[PDB]
Design an enzyme around this catalytic site. Structure first.
Site, short mmCIF file in Angstrom:
data_model
loop_
_atom_site.label_atom_id
_atom_site.label_comp_id
_atom_site.label_asym_id
_atom_site.label_seq_id
_atom_site.Cartn_x
_atom_site.Cartn_y
_atom_site.Cartn_z
N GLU A 92 5.75 5.22 11.30
CA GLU A 92 4.31 5.05 11.49
C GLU A 92 4.02 4.03 12.58
O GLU A 92 3.01 4.13 13.28
CB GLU A 92 3.65 4.64 10.18
CG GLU A 92 3.74 5.69 9.09
CD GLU A 92 2.48 5.76 8.25
OE1 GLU A 92 1.46 5.17 8.67
OE2 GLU A 92 2.50 6.40 7.18
N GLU A 100 0.83 -1.20 0.00
CA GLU A 100 0.00 0.00 0.00
C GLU A 100 0.86 1.25 0.00
O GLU A 100 0.55 2.24 -0.69
CB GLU A 100 -0.93 0.00 1.21
CG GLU A 100 -2.00 1.07 1.17
CD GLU A 100 -2.58 1.37 2.53
OE1 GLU A 100 -1.80 1.65 3.46
OE2 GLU A 100 -3.82 1.32 2.68
N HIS A 101 1.95 1.24 0.77
CA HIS A 101 2.86 2.38 0.80
C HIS A 101 3.50 2.62 -0.56
O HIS A 101 3.55 3.75 -1.05
CB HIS A 101 3.93 2.16 1.86
CG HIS A 101 3.56 2.66 3.22
ND1 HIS A 101 4.20 3.73 3.81
CD2 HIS A 101 2.63 2.24 4.11
CE1 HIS A 101 3.67 3.95 5.01
NE2 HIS A 101 2.71 3.06 5.21
#
Lengths: 445, 54
Positions: free
Chosen positions: A136, A59-60
């Site tokens: 994160e 996703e990143h």
């Protein structure tokens, strides 16, 4: 025009299916904006121990480089027409939706095709993205609400892929190389397990031929024979207590095994979960809110915020409440909240059942305004229920459930079932697990 | 001699009857009460602890 008349209008969700298996679904309306996204069945549930966290990494790196688009050129094109491109990867699904105007639909579908299909997955970008995920991870560790839910998932579905965190342990993210990610993309980003959704000024025929002209290259092949299979998970009534007295407030989330995505008992349960309701200190209702637990909490300033969740995966889900309160309230709410469940388990009247029905109707209708909520509803419903349930059907199910249905459903789910409590902070007054389990049954009933 | 033993113990028969009943009753009771104790205490006797200082 009454509620029933307006409910029928409900522009439909025509669902098609490409030969590749990509079920293209749209929802035409009149606004000049649209939301087009691809909802893939790929999450922490399918990830194994060795590659746990590959979904977050993919996703990143999805928006970073896509071969045909050299890189930041993708960002340039997306911002050229004012489109907002976003991705959300939960424990089960993962979506990349473009929030753009109706006229830019031909380009938006192409951009989504570029992201989901031809991703460069450059090693240098992998190295740069590696630090971001670790950062994160620290931010999520500071997130005092996310970690308690992760703890609940770990303690409830222990030893199962469901307990695996979405981001992944902070050891795999320091070892995940290009090979692992490419295997994840190959084995999970498959056409049959994908839904191309778009709501707004979207013509269903237009979405269909755009998918045919763009998403045709996707195939349902699975290399030699390796086919990932959904592994049913087991709910293990347990308790995890991460007592950190330095934290100002205390988070406690208690849940039991609930229904699956496709199970009628979901409809009554939410009604019951509506009766208990949710409360935050900045509400204003105070000592007058009809929810008994909320009124009790507001009267004594017991908690800072309690909510009821209905996390629901394919074969099993989490049903319960997460509450944030000071150190010397955890016991009291644990007595009160359980008691509320017990009351809903023991003696429920049509008045609060009707109240919960109205609350659930309002939640469903108000949740479905704007293009992105409708697109998300289509993408999630096609993957979970196999179809988008129209609001009229929801109205029928809510009309069916009454006090007897709520009582029997809660008894089958709440009565004498081992919970999955999970705490964080100065959790000391939190009753011992046997106290909580004993609270699950009432010696009067 | 047996008559005198009965005389100073005019409950011998019934005393041994109670002995039999109590013996079997608590031969049942001890395992079950112990099982209940272990059932309730089993949470404590399986607490996997951890320590993760920063």
């Amino acid at each position: 025009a009454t509620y029933a008349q307006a409910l029928q209008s409900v522009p439909e969700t025509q669902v098609s299916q490409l030969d590749n298996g990509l079920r293209v679904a749209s929802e035409q309306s009149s606004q000049p904006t649209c939301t087009v996204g691809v909802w893939i069945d790929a999450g922490s549930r399918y990830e194994n121990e060795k590659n746990n966290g590959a979904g977050y990494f993919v996703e990143h790196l999805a928006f970073k480089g896509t071969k045909n688009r050299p890189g930041s050129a993708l960002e340039k094109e997306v911002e050229s027409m004012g489109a907002h491109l976003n991705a959300y990867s939960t424990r089960e699904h993962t979506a990349y939706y473009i929030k753009a105007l109706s006229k830019d639909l031909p380009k938006a579908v192409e951009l989504l095709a570029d992201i989901v299909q031809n991703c460069s997955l450059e090693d240098s970008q992998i190295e740069k993205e590696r630090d971001v995920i670790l950062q994160e991870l620290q931010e999520n560790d500071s997130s005092m609400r996310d970690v308690v839910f992760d703890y609940l998932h770990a303690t409830a579905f222990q030893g199962t892929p469901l307990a695996q965190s979405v981001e992944g342990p902070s050891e795999n993210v320091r070892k995940l190389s290009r090979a692992d990610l490419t295997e994840y993309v190959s084995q999970h980003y498959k056409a049959p397990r994908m839904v191309l959704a778009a709501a707004g000024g979207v013509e269903h025929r237009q979405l269909l031929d755009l998918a045919q002209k763009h998403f045709s290259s996707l195939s349902g092949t699975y290399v030699e024979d390796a086919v990932p299979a959904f592994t049913p998970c087991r709910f293990t009534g347990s308790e995890i207590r991460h007592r950190d007295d330095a934290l100002p407030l205390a988070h406690v989330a208690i849940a039991v095994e609930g229904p699956g995505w496709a199970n009628p008992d979901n409809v009554p349960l939410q009604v019951a979960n509506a009766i208990i309701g949710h409360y935050d200190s900045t509400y204003g209702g105070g000592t007058h809110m009809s929810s008994t637990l909320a009124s009790v909490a507001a009267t004594r300033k017991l908690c800072q915020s309690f909510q009821t969740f209905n996390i629901c995966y394919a074969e099993t889900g989490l049903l319960g409440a997460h509450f944030v309160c000071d150190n010397m309230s955890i016991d009291d709410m644990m007595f009160f909240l359980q008691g509320q469940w017990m009351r809903l388990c023991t003696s429920a009247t049509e008045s609060e059942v009707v109240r919960g029905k109205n609350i659930l109707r309002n939640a469903l209708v108000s949740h479905l305004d704007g293009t992105t909520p409708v697109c998300e509803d289509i993408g999630r419903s096609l993957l979970t229920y196999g179809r988008r349930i129209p609001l009229a059907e929801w109205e029928s199910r809510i009309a069916e459930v009454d006090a007897s249905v709520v009582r029997e459903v809660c008894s089958k789910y709440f009565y004498d079932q081992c919970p999955a409590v999970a705490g964080l902070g100065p959790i000391e007054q939190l009753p011992d697990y046997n106290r909580i389990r004993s609270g699950m049954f009432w010696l009067r009933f | 001699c047996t008559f005198l033993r009965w005389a100073s113990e005019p409950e011998h028969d019934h005393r041994k009857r109670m002995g039999l009943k109590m013996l079997m009753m608590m031969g049942l009771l001890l395992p079950l009460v112990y099982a209940m104790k272990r059932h309730k205490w089993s949470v404590l006797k399986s607490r996997k602890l951890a320590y993760r200082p920063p």
